[PDB]
Amino acid sequence: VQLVESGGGLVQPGGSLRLSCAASGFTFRNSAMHWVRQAPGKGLEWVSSIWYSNTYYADSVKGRFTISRDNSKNTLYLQMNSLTAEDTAVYYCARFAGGWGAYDVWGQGTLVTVSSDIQMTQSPSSLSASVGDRVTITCRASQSIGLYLAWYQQKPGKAPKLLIYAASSLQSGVPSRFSGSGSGTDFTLTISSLQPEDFATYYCQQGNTLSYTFGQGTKVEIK
Amino acid sequence: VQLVESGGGLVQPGGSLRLSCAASGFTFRNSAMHWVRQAPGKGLEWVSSIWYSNTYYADSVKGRFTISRDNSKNTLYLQMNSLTAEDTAVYYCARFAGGWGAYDVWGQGTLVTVSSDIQMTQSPSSLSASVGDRVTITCRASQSIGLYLAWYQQKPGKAPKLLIYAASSLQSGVPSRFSGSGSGTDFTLTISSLQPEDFATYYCQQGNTLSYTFGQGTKVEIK
């Protein structure tokens, strides 16, 4: 009882790809077949279902992907169109045992990478502080970005606001308790004495490279 | 100096939507304009840019979205096609100061929700244990799934393997040190005495509802 997948590969965003899942060792025609995917380092996510015929799709792929089957070849297909980087994942086909509500046979998986630079690692992800505390947030770049590192403040329900650019230059009107430092790959934002209005999420952003990338944010929360 | 967005709303997967960003208080024709988006509860992500004419797109939207501008109306547009749930986000337009490498004017944001649903909360996300330890993993459903809860084991580079279905039934061949319990909304997987082959990631999955959602996984790691 086996499911053998094929068709994965590297594809440009906006492009198309068709996955195949060849079954053997069981009566393919009788069985409900699903696709489930797993982004790199992430969890399992249901994608699509087909049975003997009402087919179903998750909102992640509905309207772009088509599931189908050729019972004479004991094969399941996933036609993937208008691909995005967010579709990058290992795609598994699986047999669904509808009496159990569970998948009892899995393919080996096939990797689909949707791709045509600099990673920004912000730390900590969150911190709790009190009014009056000194706070320092760090942002590391995987490659030198020179001085082109900016810091933004974002309050709940509001747009980001530029505070610091070129690593250490303050935007007009930004209070002097904010300062920035660093060059190349290591950068710091410091708040000298936290005020109530400063509890917010802070983001760094590199502006040296054509695909501008943001740090993941630091939530400055109240003790 | 303002950016006023419009166009967001609720759209079906696979559908289209056009966002607008009306500029005032500054000379629009000279300025590089970008779109940056933020999924609910997540960080900022660059989407697309346009200047006076070479336009750029992130791999998340390249080949599906089109950025454009009408200088006579001082307006920036984002044409969104072939939409996915992963496009759900607040979309910001922003003026890019190319000398600073930073965004110095931001719109107020407009929300795009791409949608046509049990939530499974697994805990803990990870745990360290030693050979011989008793381990319990819990899975909670946002509403009753009855008994239709399954548990899978996944080792690095391998496909998931069914261990338990219908909350407490073991798949054939699964060792007796694995057991499951629970009904309705609270479920538990227990390993009575951990063996080296049991260090793996474990996933729960509800099979009561047509969306078949997975828990986020529990990584059982070695002390």
Author numbering:
A (entry chain H), B (entry chain A): 2 to 53, 56 to 119, 125 to 231
Q: What did the publication describing this PDB structure actually write?
A:
Diabodies are among the smallest of these bispecific antibodies. They are constructed by connecting heavy-chain variable fragments (VH) and light-chain variable fragments (VL) with short “GGGGS” peptide linkers. Therefore, the two VH-linker-VL chains associate to form a dimer with two antigen binding sites, each consisting of the VH and VL fragments from the different chains.
During this study, we by accident determined the structure of a non-functional monospecific diabody. We had intended to produce a bispecific diabody, 6277, and to try to determine its structure. In order to understand what caused the chain shuffling, we compared the crystal structure of the shuffled monospecific diabody and predicted model of the intended bispecific diabody. This movement appears to have been triggered by interaction between Trp103 of the CDR3 loop of the heavy chain and the Tyr49 of the CDR2 loop of the light chain. However, the nonfunctional monospecific diabody form appears to be selectively crystallized under our crystallization conditions.
